[PDB]
Design a binder for this molecule. Structure first.
Ligand SMILES: *O=P([O])([O])OP([O])(=O)O[C][C]1O[C](N2[C]=[C]C(=O)[N]C2=O)[C]([O])[C]1[O]
Ligand SMILES: *O=P([O])([O])OP([O])(=O)O[C][C]1O[C](N2[C]=[C]C(=O)[N]C2=O)[C]([O])[C]1[O]
Ligand SMILES: OC[C@H]1O[C@@H](O[C@@H]2[C@@H](O)[C@H](O)O[C@H](CO)[C@@H]2O)[C@H](O)[C@@H](O)[C@H]1O
Ligand SMILES: [Mn+2]
Ligand SMILES: [Mn+2]
Lengths: 250, 246
């Protein structure tokens, strides 16, 4: 069962650092195909270079992002388009899996923290699977309430009106189910935190969710965020004509 | 050649996450021995459990520090390497005297590429390489000329203007200098120097990373999670189950 990890990424100071630790974590997982989608005009040397050197099975994708400020929407839908045979690769495996292929799709932002155990949990998804997510929604962890092996509620707080009050990193979807539901995609016009539900509503009813991670008692992924680097000194040095050598990638 | 990674850690919301992605990166490095020292009153089940399930060669140490942080913890790892014992888990026996190896001080929130470790494995005395996103710069790094450290690309004021993550020390040199340790009273920018002045002259530093032309380690920091909601649910008697580890 191959796991397809959809990861939208964009250039900023901590980008390479984020892709380095993430790609290194992904190299621990067998049967994993990384769909890295750059939010850029075209493929960048930085990302192309990191992928080629990663040693991972991957497909490089690119799409530009054109009030609620959703992040990575277009990039995620681009990965979905590719999976549905609408092309778009610029590197790596050019052809998507043919229909009938078994597999699971997981949307992994480039700044979260993922334990290798998480991937074995989602590898057996029939429709849509779920598990708790740490340090998200303003909670220690947000996650499905499980009873008798079934989801009967949710431990959440923010925007409780959400049919699926779970984070992007808190679920995975069966590849066959995605192809069998062509209208399933992320809605960029969706309110602040209803992005997840905009995709999932086309796939299942929350009652049909497959609880994983020891019936949602284990937190195997964390919604970590990196601090924006301090650059006051870099700014001053540049004015003096001695800024950090730009020919050295960071 | 074994690499001894000394990592001080402490309990806070992101600790487990930090330790998870750090240990996963380390499991990609051969001949590596992890010296994880907790800044706590005793071994925490969280860390003990993470170490046991990591499949890494490690030694677990503890020491509480009631201003530069993680200092006492790093010094205890050094004490252990000097046969002064102090382990509470993992490999209790330190490397025998005259053992070859290199010591690297890796904070638990930085980002380290696998290549970094292969660069430091050749350390004779003390080696150096650039560090990204640190000191207010895209990167700080030694200035190399003819394969010799002739200066330092830095902004903040120091005999050794390099971050904790930008150097490694040969094990034999550390044993040879029994007084070489971090000064817990040394202010932030002088912590690295308090140790290195006991070991070598900055002009004897061995430049790595293609003569310091590549950034293989980043000084990333993790945002503190907002917990307003947790506090609200706590008032209502339904906070995140304390029995579910995060
Ligand atoms: O605030 P969050 O932490 O939920 O979101 P994020 O910052 O981690 O963004 C989500 C994903 O999309 C990427 N992205 C962000 C901003 C942008 O302009 N373009 C993007 O592709 C980012 O790398 C994440 O993977
Ligand atoms: O500000 P920096 O990013 O240089 O430092 P840090 O926050 O990453 O701390 C350095 C190391 O020491 C640990 N530590 C931190 C605070 C404390 O009270 N006790 C500690 O042991 C931390 O985990 C880092 O590894
Ligand atoms: O499942 C949680 C949900 O959180 C949304 O983000 C919210 C923020 O927009 C708001 O400012 O704070 C909230 C916490 O009180 C919460 O973090 C995400 O948009 C969504 O993806 C999901 O993570
Ligand atoms: Mn994020
Ligand atoms: Mn740090």
């Amino acid at each position: 069962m191959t796991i397809y990890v959809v990861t939208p990424t964009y250039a900023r100071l901590v980008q390479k650092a984020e892709l380095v630790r993430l790609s290194q974590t992904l190299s621990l997982v067998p049967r994993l195909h990384w769909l890295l989608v750059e939010d850029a005009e075209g493929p960048t040397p930085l990302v192309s270079g990191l992928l080629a050197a990663s040693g991972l099975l991957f497909t490089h994708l690119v799409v530009l992002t054109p009030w609620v400020h959703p992040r990575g929407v277009e990039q995620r839908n681009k990965a979905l388009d590719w999976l549905r045979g609408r092309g778009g690769a610029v590197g790596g495996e050019k052809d998507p899996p043919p229909p009938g292929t078994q597999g699971v799709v997981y949307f992994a932002d480039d700044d979260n923290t993922y334990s290798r155990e998480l991937f074995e949990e989602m590898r057996w998804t029939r429709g849509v699977s779920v598990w708790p997510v740490g340090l998200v929604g303003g909670l220690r962890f947000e996650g499905p309430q499980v009873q008798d092996g079934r989801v009967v509620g949710f431990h959440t707080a923010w925007e409780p009106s959400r049919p699926f009050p779970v984070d992007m990193a808190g679920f995975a979807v069966a590849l066959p189910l995605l192809l069998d539901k062509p209208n399933a995609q992320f809605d960029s016009t969706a309110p602040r935190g209803h992005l997840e539900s905009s995709l999932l509503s086309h796939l299942v009813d929350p009652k049909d969710l497959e609880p994983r991670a020891a019936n949602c008692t284990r937190v195997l992924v964390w919604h970590t965020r990196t601090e924006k680097p301090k650059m006051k000194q870099e700014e001053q040095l540049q004015r003096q004509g001695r800024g950090s050598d730009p020919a050295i990638e960071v």
